[PDB]
């Protein structure tokens, strides 16, 4: 409720509860957290523009070519990653509002 600007608005009730009865050893009570948020894209954004600094230079690349890895494996791994970061944008600010669709058929007597 009080952090509701920080939850995905189309997954109403985002939580999983699990509770063991046995504490950790020498504390009275404790909890361990596991959170899936779009905010983690700063990791993937950083790694992918950093990569650009190395690879638009082809810096260090010989140490992968020295083990028979090629630029096309680079190119495919970068293109997975930009695709991964784009889908974060797709789930960031994602609208909880409904869609609709509409289309027309035939032709006018002038174009």
């Amino acid at each position: 409720n009080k952090n509701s600007s920080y939850f995905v608005e189309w997954i109403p009730n985002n939580v999983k509860t699990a509770v063991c009865d046995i504490p950790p050893r020498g504390l009275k009570m404790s909890a361990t957290f596991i959170g899936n948020s779009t905010a983690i894209q700063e990791l993937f954004k950083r790694i992918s523009e950093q990569f650009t600094a190395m690879f638009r230079r082809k810096a260090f690349l010989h140490w992968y070519t020295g083990e028979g890895m090629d630029e096309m494996e680079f190119t495919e791994a970068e293109s997975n990653m930009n695709d991964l970061v784009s889908e974060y944008q797709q789930y960031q600010d994602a609208t909880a509002d409904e869609q609709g669709e509409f289309e027309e058929e035939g032709e006018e007597d002038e174009a």
Binding site: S48, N82, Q90, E98, E101
Partner: protein, 49 residues
């Protein structure tokens, strides 16, 4: 005796042609460019109403 002997090369000189400069330095043209493409992209809805 003559102190510069005949035992020594006396090859007489030739009509050598005129001297060209060492370097041309002809003018350059700038290379072409188009603008950089965005790599991370906008996407559509995978799911409809």
């Amino acid at each position: 005796s003559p102190g510069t002997p005949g035992s020594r090369s006396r090859t007489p000189s030739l009509p050598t042609p005129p001297t060209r400069e060492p370097k041309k330095v002809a003018v350059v043209r700038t290379p072409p460019k188009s603008p950089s493409s965005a790599k991370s992209r906008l996407q559509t809805a995978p799911v409809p109403m």
